[PDB]
Motif scaffolding. Structure first.
Motif, mmCIF file in Angstrom:
data_model
loop_
_atom_site.group_PDB
_atom_site.id
_atom_site.type_symbol
_atom_site.label_atom_id
_atom_site.label_comp_id
_atom_site.label_asym_id
_atom_site.label_seq_id
_atom_site.Cartn_x
_atom_site.Cartn_y
_atom_site.Cartn_z
ATOM 1 N N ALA A 1 -24.630 -3.996 -6.594
ATOM 2 C CA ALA A 1 -25.674 -3.195 -7.106
ATOM 3 C C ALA A 1 -25.975 -4.680 -8.518
ATOM 4 N N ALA A 2 -27.554 -4.411 -8.796
ATOM 5 C CA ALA A 2 -28.160 -5.419 -10.066
ATOM 6 C C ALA A 2 -28.568 -4.249 -11.067
ATOM 7 N N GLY A 3 -28.690 -2.906 -10.708
ATOM 8 C CA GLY A 3 -30.034 -2.351 -11.952
ATOM 9 C C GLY A 3 -28.970 -1.685 -12.627
ATOM 10 N N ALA A 4 -27.622 -1.180 -12.589
ATOM 11 C CA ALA A 4 -26.664 -0.846 -13.409
ATOM 12 C C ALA A 4 -25.727 -0.139 -12.423
ATOM 13 N N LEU A 6 -22.984 1.370 -13.459
ATOM 14 C CA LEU A 6 -22.572 3.213 -14.348
ATOM 15 C C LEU A 6 -21.449 3.037 -13.284
ATOM 16 N N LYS A 7 -20.786 3.173 -13.729
ATOM 17 C CA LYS A 7 -19.343 2.809 -13.228
ATOM 18 C C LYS A 7 -18.213 4.041 -13.615
ATOM 19 N N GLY A 8 -17.492 4.593 -12.507
ATOM 20 C CA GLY A 8 -16.693 5.304 -13.389
ATOM 21 C C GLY A 8 -15.192 5.568 -12.965
ATOM 22 N N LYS A 9 -14.448 6.320 -12.589
ATOM 23 C CA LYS A 9 -12.407 6.623 -11.750
ATOM 24 C C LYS A 9 -12.069 7.710 -10.936
ATOM 25 N N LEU A 10 -11.611 7.937 -10.190
ATOM 26 C CA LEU A 10 -11.340 9.119 -9.399
ATOM 27 C C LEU A 10 -9.814 8.538 -9.107
ATOM 28 N N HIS A 11 -9.385 9.891 -8.802
ATOM 29 C CA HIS A 11 -8.121 9.618 -8.851
ATOM 30 C C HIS A 11 -7.429 9.537 -7.285
ATOM 31 N N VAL A 12 -6.204 8.530 -7.100
ATOM 32 C CA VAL A 12 -5.264 8.708 -5.774
ATOM 33 C C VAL A 12 -5.011 10.009 -6.105
ATOM 34 N N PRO A 13 -5.077 10.230 -4.964
ATOM 35 C CA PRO A 13 -3.799 11.727 -4.466
ATOM 36 C C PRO A 13 -2.359 10.505 -3.331
ATOM 37 N N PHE A 14 -1.999 11.803 -2.988
ATOM 38 C CA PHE A 14 -0.572 11.951 -2.609
ATOM 39 C C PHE A 14 0.712 9.687 -3.086
ATOM 40 N N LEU A 15 0.723 10.539 -4.370
ATOM 41 C CA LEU A 15 1.342 9.600 -5.097
ATOM 42 C C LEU A 15 3.041 9.369 -4.537
ATOM 43 N N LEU A 16 3.910 8.560 -5.220
ATOM 44 C CA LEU A 16 4.926 8.939 -4.954
ATOM 45 C C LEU A 16 6.131 9.579 -5.337
ATOM 46 N N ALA A 17 6.797 10.688 -5.140
ATOM 47 C CA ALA A 17 7.526 11.525 -6.513
ATOM 48 C C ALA A 17 8.521 11.593 -5.315
ATOM 49 N N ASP A 18 9.665 12.003 -6.387
ATOM 50 C CA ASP A 18 11.520 12.501 -6.340
ATOM 51 C C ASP A 18 11.021 13.595 -5.110
ATOM 52 N N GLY A 19 12.398 13.616 -4.976
ATOM 53 C CA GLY A 19 12.468 14.454 -4.198
ATOM 54 C C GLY A 19 14.403 14.460 -3.553
ATOM 55 N N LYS A 20 14.332 15.617 -2.974
ATOM 56 C CA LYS A 20 16.158 15.708 -1.809
ATOM 57 C C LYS A 20 15.472 15.620 -0.357
ATOM 58 N N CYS A 21 16.494 14.093 -0.424
ATOM 59 C CA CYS A 21 16.193 14.041 1.359
ATOM 60 C C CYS A 21 17.446 14.030 2.471
ATOM 61 N N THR A 22 17.766 14.380 3.684
ATOM 62 C CA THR A 22 18.555 14.335 4.496
ATOM 63 C C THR A 22 19.107 13.262 5.282
ATOM 64 N N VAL A 23 20.526 12.923 4.672
ATOM 65 C CA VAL A 23 20.864 11.159 5.421
ATOM 66 C C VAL A 23 21.202 12.280 5.840
ATOM 67 N N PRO A 24 22.150 11.015 7.301
ATOM 68 C CA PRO A 24 23.027 11.507 8.429
ATOM 69 C C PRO A 24 24.830 11.509 7.579
ATOM 70 N N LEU A 25 25.914 11.994 8.380
ATOM 71 C CA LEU A 25 26.728 11.532 7.826
ATOM 72 C C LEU A 25 27.598 10.671 9.510
ATOM 73 N N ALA A 26 28.684 9.205 8.595
ATOM 74 C CA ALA A 26 28.635 8.962 9.761
ATOM 75 C C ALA A 26 30.009 9.788 10.320
ATOM 76 N N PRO A 27 30.653 9.190 11.137
ATOM 77 C CA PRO A 27 31.757 9.582 12.160
ATOM 78 C C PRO A 27 32.981 9.391 11.796
ATOM 79 N N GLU A 28 33.777 10.630 11.799
ATOM 80 C CA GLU A 28 35.278 10.171 10.432
ATOM 81 C C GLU A 28 35.924 9.050 11.089
ATOM 82 N N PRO A 29 36.645 8.210 9.759
ATOM 83 C CA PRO A 29 37.265 7.128 10.404
ATOM 84 C C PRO A 29 39.000 7.610 10.439
#
Lengths: 48, 48
Positions: A1-4, A6-29
């Motif tokens: 625009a050209a009138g004004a 008039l700017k502002g900011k708004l938050h991004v949700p769904f940020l990238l946070a830590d946590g525990k996740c489940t990983v496979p355990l390989a077949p036993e050697p």
């Protein structure tokens, strides 16, 4: 625009946070010993 | 064998050859010369 810029900011949700996740355990050697040598028989379920 | 008074006898010593090795595996009509392990020496991730 050209009138004004008039700017502002708004938050991004769904940020990238830590946590525990489940990983496979390989077949036993299978570790066959030998004189100053280990021997490993490996049988992966997936690229390991 | 005997037909009309004749007596025919064939062999032996057809060069004593075989393709069939000492250990054979049968699957889906197909035959393979695999060194299959005995009953109680089969390891995981292998035939047996």
């Amino acid at each position: 625009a050209a009138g004004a810029t008039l700017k502002g900011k708004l938050h991004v949700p769904f940020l990238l946070a830590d946590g525990k996740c489940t990983v496979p355990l390989a077949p036993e050697p299978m570790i066959t010993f030998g004189f100053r040598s280990v021997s490993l028989k490996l049988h992966p379920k997936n690229p390991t | 064998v005997n037909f009309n008074g004749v007596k025919i006898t064939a062999g032996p010593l057809s060069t004593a050859w075989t393709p069939f090795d000492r250990k054979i595996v049968q699957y889906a009509g197909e035959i393979y010369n695999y060194d299959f392990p005995e009953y109680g020496a089969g390891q995981p991730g292998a035939f047996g």
